[PDB]
């Protein structure tokens, strides 16, 4: 009723704990558009909505924070998911990014070449992906689970995120992997969002709040994107555009959370339950040294 | 004793009635901001449009050297302001005007000293 006022839409529970077989998406819209303000992109909008919904739940957030950003050039030869991801964060903040195809931007330092040559010394507090390939979508033979760059992001995340720190990581019909929805399990919390300026398409992000270090609940993945499909094809969404005319409350706000190092014997029951609340974080605070490998042949 | 000189051959096509250069980065805000020339975050007012630094400098989009002993460049990381009945051409706007070193604004356009 009252959803065309909102920035999106999210998976409710009674939908997730179902049991479906997998069928083809087909929807109401398709060739609807959306009619943007004034000289204004169509990414600059999306990349909006997505950071005024992050506003409503429980993140950490302390003094000289961590960011790194994947898949963020493009066909023009500049970055515009960077400039809003800028103005969002508090002043003093550190941020690093990358890409496949040369390109000029506005962060502290920049990397050039294909995901699996690039290596970090320490750990980070918040991780965001836009990466894509478009020979993925064919019509003409069965749709199964892929590997290529999903196979580098589960190993990532289990050696270099801190507990207590967050995600987010996009998806479509046919480009999807099975273990990324079994991890999903290691977190206090979890969904799936969609945008009101696209929602003529079968894009979402899939988010993780609040992170442990070992198994919560069992979930098969096969199962999970079938249901996720069911959703979709009984349900139509409308188009709009309202929420970016009021931008007096945008920024972030400044908690101060607390920082300690331990050992892998001291965690009890008092622990756990402060990091499931969004109250601290856990690692070094040394310096920060990156790289990147080069093949000699020519 | 040879070098070559950029920042006059793009004066030079504009005034034969060539096309300005396109794609520079526009943001969302509120217009009721404080008028002054290059900041930390975003501060037009009723009559101007705000812009991201890197995607508006001469040097940075052509891939040539910046014009100083040690190379830096004064936009590359913050936000710059410009006039409404001006924002057709961003990048030949900022290579000819000059700030106000005691107040911040442009000279021409809101200083208001001597
Ligand atoms: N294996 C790989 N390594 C690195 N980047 C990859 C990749 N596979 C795909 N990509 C990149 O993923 C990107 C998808 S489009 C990105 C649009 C951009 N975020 C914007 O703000 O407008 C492409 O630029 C592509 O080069
Ligand atoms: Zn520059
Ligand atoms: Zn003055």
Redesign the pocket.
């Known amino acids: 009723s009252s959803q065309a006022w909102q920035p999106g839409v999210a998976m409710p529970n009674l939908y997730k704990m179902q049991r479906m077989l997998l069928e083809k998406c087909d929807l109401q819209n398709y060739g609807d558009s959306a009619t943007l303000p004034k000289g204004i992109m169509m990414?600059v909008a999306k990349?909006t909505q997505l950071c005024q919904y992050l506003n409503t739940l429980t993140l950490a957030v302390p003094y000289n924070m961590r960011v790194i950003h994947?898949?963020?050039?493009?066909?023009?030869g500049v970055?515009?998911?960077?400039a809003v991801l800028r103005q969002w964060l508090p002043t003093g903040t550190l941020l690093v990014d990358?890409?496949?195809?040369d390109f000029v931007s506005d962060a502290d330092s920049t990397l050039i070449?294909?995901?699996?040559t690039v290596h970090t010394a320490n750990k980070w507090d918040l991780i965001i992906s836009?990466?894509?390939?478009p020979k993925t979508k064919k019509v003409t033979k069965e749709n199964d689970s892929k590997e290529?760059?999903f196979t580098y992001i589960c190993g990532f995340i289990q050696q270099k995120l801190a507990l207590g720190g967050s995600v987010a990581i996009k998806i479509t019909e046919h480009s999807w992997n099975a273990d990324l929805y079994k991890l999903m399990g290691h977190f206090a919390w979890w969904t799936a969002f969609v945008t009101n300026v696209n929602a003529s398409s079968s894009e979402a992000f899939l988010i993780g709040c609040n992170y442990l270090g070992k198994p919560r609940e069992q979930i098969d993945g096969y199962v999970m994107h079938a249901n996720y499909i069911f959703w979709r094809n009984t349900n139509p969404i409308q188009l709009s555009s309202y929420s970016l005319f009021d931008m007096s409350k945008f920024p972030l706000k400044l908690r101060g959370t607390a920082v300690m190092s331990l050992k892998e014997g001291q965690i009890n029951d008092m622990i756990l339950s402060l990091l499931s609340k969004g109250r601290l974080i856990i690692r070094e605070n040394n310096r920060v040294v990156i790289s990147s490998d080069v093949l000699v042949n020519n | 004793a040879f070098a070559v000189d950029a920042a006059k051959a793009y004066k030079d096509y504009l005034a034969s009635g060539g096309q300005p250069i396109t794609n520079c980065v526009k943001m969302l805000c509120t217009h009721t901001g404080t008028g002054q020339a290059i900041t930390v975050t975003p501060e037009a007012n009723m009559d101007q449009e705000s812009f991201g630094g890197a995607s508006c400098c001469l040097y940075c989009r052509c891939h040539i050297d910046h014009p100083n002993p040690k190379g830096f460049c004064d936009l590359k990381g913050k936000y710059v302001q410009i006039p409404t009945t001006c924002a057709n051409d961003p990048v030949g706007f900022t290579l000819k005007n000059t700030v106000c070193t005691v107040c911040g604004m442009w000279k021409g356009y809101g200083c208001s000293c001597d």
């Open positions: 990414n990349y994947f898949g963020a050039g493009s066909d023009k970055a515009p998911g960077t990358s890409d496949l195809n070449g294909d995901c699996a836009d990466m894509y390939d290529g760059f």
